[PDB]
Ligand binder design. Structure first.
Ligand SMILES: Cc1cc(N2CC[C@@](C#N)(C3CC3)C2=O)cc(NC(=O)Cc2ccccc2)n1
Ligand SMILES: Cc1cc(N2CC[C@@](C#N)(C3CC3)C2=O)cc(NC(=O)Cc2ccccc2)n1
Lengths: 483, 483
């Protein structure tokens, strides 16, 4: 049983939810966590979704080495310096990302416009060795991801791909994980080092008021092509720099999903990614025809699987139905199906949905289409409720004086901004200081930073001033405390 | 074009075959190679096969960290000692294998016999940092693999799983990759450190006479359970050690496939793993109805894909058909389909098989079933020819005096052996010395070691003596030079 309340001690709630559901195990190296099958299966599902989608775009998978030489990297990094006891003459780094590993090869492979576009992806893990507090799934020292890297003859084609991938990330979060996200452009201070423009999808954790970057898609432009001499010839033979993109998304997505839909009973997993969509729990009275009940459960499982419903029967005789109900609730199975002698006699089954607890009596003949309908209802309900919480979590403001009250309500702020990079640094420092003072009156950082400049922009009145500098505002920008 | 001959300079042939087909790219860290899509797709195919098969056994995937603490590992390793410039207080190692990473968790997770069997697998890369000459695919410093790890209430159930997995590895090599392998038991000196009994499938490279371990499946017994205190209670409450297995297989399999089937024109890829099974090459005379020809090629592609045949049309107008024929031969596509105006007029297509060059004229209505039949014929032919070469490569001998002649014929030897571990060390040293002398008369190591003790044992006459010690022979053992 989960016993911390999600709305009272969120940190303890999260730990209990992911440990008691058997998703994670701890490890004696800080910032690294074991992903057990209950979590890993969800990763496999979103991996298959994204892989199928980028394959349709002509992206192909590959595998590049986990090590990068010092001079290539330096053209929060873990450095290998010894094999056994023998020092290496040049230290080598574990990849935090693979631009410097892949792009010398790109420079070799690309010669003609006929070689473009080049589109590669790899599924691997990377290491970003930071000393700040790690969080299971959300912010870890090693994490699983995919990184895609493309090169194009024109900036416009590269940008179109940046946005196509960002839309795939929106679908990963909203359509698979039922997590609402906001598409936007990163600030100059927050964009990828060396890139031209970084786009992002941002999510929100209401219980601690924090934004979090859900995935990222970078227009690198010609910057890395200049760095690595990646050029192509047109048909007349003139050499030009390629235009590049890089994009990535990680197991952070699972953590965001967990935090968005979980409740006081534990996990709630959206049906579209749940490894068990329906758990069948037979009633096993000592004084019943148990073989008949179990046989009917097997028949129902076969029937549901013909509709591609993922089913598990928990026929263990050493646990009670009440124990099983709690067990699979903690694990987030979206539907429970109960079958006992009285149901058998009626030709029906009792189905309980995990998100609301509502129960249904459903005839066996109706079971497959009704459960498909119910699972789409659960998926949409999880998304719509999360989207309403996202909406309620964003305050539209006009001046910096409104920031700290809004942050104290654990909200994000949407504010007109002049987009001066110095002003973002100053806002970060000032909000951190004010947060510290408030903490001392009270008995992760308190700084507010930009999350993104949203693609969907409210109207900007003619003389609207920047909320911090008073200079002419340029765009509406989303800010908050952040991971 | 490949221009080194496979039977004249095998090393150069192999390099040309894997580079000119765009399977590999070199890298500025020795022993690490980039896997380009043409190779990576084959890895994806065998990964899907093996993953589906172990899922049917109740194995579930997971992900454990790439780092292991020094004391846990030490309860050819690359050591991380710094993040940026900050030294760590305890150095941490990159996994060469994950027993010491996973089994503390196993000890925590396993409490009751009801928790058994526990069956986990992960797909990842590992690092074994050796200074010997590396070989693309076959012997690398970092390599992709899967490692499976199971725990059972009895030794017999664990052993049954060891053999079930070994059979899956036989299917991986023989049924997917059309590479014949020999199942056997490793010698005491060659078995997994800490394990009870190691089983193996061994393959053979005729051109350099070398055996190579294709995959491995270990009965760990209770040894690691003792090391890590992995115990379970029976229903009456007595604690007993679990019985464990570990097994692994790597991208080495791709290299073995390449070496087994390739020819002087380049790669030959078995249809069951070829990412392009049929390449359609339209004839594109300037004075023809090119749109009609290309339209028919599209129709044929759709028809073939309804039979799950993997098809690519090479409709590039800037290369000749002869250029395309060579291009896709070098890449190992098992079937080429040619279509020009005269074929269109006849309602047929011309199909050329990559392994033998035989051509067929096939009606469009017959195309799908005939090509399925032809691909199964190519697959079986590749396997049967490789199996005959394996058979011709093994000499059954009686005394050590016959070893060096057989090795000079680039053969393996099957010999009666007393199985004394000291005798294996002495045979290794003696054959290395004799090889060195022969080298100096002539203008990788020359040592002969055990490859395995095959499951399929010839009859052992009553008084048969060991070929090296003259003591009573115990079993027939397969020896050769080795990777
Ligand atoms: C699990 C996960 C995810 C991500 N990040 C980054 C942005 C990104 C996005 N979008 C990546 C480009 C794809 C993402 O997901 C980052 C991380 N760890 C770290 O920064 C290291 C760390 C560890 C402990 C505390 C503080 C920092 N850990
Ligand atoms: C690609 C690949 C494969 C394998 N091995 C091992 C046995 C095994 C089997 N069966 C593993 C258990 C699964 C296998 O495939 C091993 C390796 N590198 C190494 O030993 C490191 C190395 C590098 C250069 C020269 C010498 C040694 N490199």
């Amino acid at each position: 049983m989960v016993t911390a309340k999600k709305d009272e001690n969120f940190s303890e709630w999260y730990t209990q939810a992911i440990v008691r559901s058997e998703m994670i195990e701890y490890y004696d190296i800080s910032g690294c966590y074991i992903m057990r099958p209950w979590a890993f299966h969800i990763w496999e599902k979103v991996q298959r979704f994204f892989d199928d989608e980028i394959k349709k775009m002509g992206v192909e998978n590959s595998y590049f080495p986990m090590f990068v030489s010092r001079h290539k990297l330096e053209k929060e990094v873990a450095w290998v310096t010894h094999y056994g006891d023998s020092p290496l003459p040049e230290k080598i780094a574990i990849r935090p990302t693979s631009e410097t590993i892949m792009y010398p090869a790109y420079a070799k492979w690309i010669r003609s416009h006929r070689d473009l576009p080049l589109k590669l992806n790899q599924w691997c893990s990377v290491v970003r060795w930071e000393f700040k507090q790690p969080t299971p799934f959300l912010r870890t020292r090693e994490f699983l991801w995919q990184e895609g890297h493309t090169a194009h003859a024109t900036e416009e084609e590269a940008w179109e791909l940046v946005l196509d991938i960002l839309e795939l990330y929106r679908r990963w979060y909203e359509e698979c994980l039922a997590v609402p996200v906001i598409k936007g452009e990163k600030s100059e201070g927050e964009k990828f080092a060396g890139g031209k423009k970084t786009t992002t999808v941002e999510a929100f954790i209401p219980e601690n008021g924090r934004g979090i970057q859900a995935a990222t898609s970078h227009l690198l432009g010609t910057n890395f092509a200049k760095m690595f001499e990646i050029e192509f010839e047109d048909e007349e033979g003139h050499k030009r720099l390629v235009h590049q993109t890089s994009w990535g998304c990680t197991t952070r997505s699972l953590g965001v999903m967990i935090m968005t839909h979980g409740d006081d009973k534990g996990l709630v997993i959206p049906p579209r990614v749940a490894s068990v969509q329906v758990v069948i729990i037979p009633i096993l009275f000592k004084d019943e025809n148990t073989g008949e009940i179990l046989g009917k459960c097997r028949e129902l499982k076969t029937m549901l699987e013909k509709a591609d419903i993922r089913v598990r029967i928990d026929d263990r005789s050493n646990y009670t139905p009440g124990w099983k109900y709690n067990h699979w609730e903690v694990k987030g199975v979206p539907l429970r199906l109960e079958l006992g002698p009285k149901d058998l006699a009626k030709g029906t089954a009792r189905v309980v949905r995990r998100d609301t607890g509502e129960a249904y009596q459903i005839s066996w003949a109706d079971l497959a289409p009704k459960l498909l309908e119910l699972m789409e209802g659960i998926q949409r309900s999880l998304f719509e409720k999360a989207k309403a919480r996202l909406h309620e979590g964003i305050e539209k403001i006009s001046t910096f004086d409104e920031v700290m009250p809004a942050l104290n309500r654990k909200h994000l702020v949407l504010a007109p901004w002049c987009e001066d990079p110095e002003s973002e640094e100053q806002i970060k420092k000032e909000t951190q200081k004010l947060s510290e003072i408030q903490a001392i009156e009270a008995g992760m950082t308190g700084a507010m930073k930009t999350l993104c400049i949203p693609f969907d922009q409210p109207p900007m009145p003619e003389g609207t001033k920047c909320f911090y500098t008073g200079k002419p505002a340029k765009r509406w920008t989303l800010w908050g405390r952040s991971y």
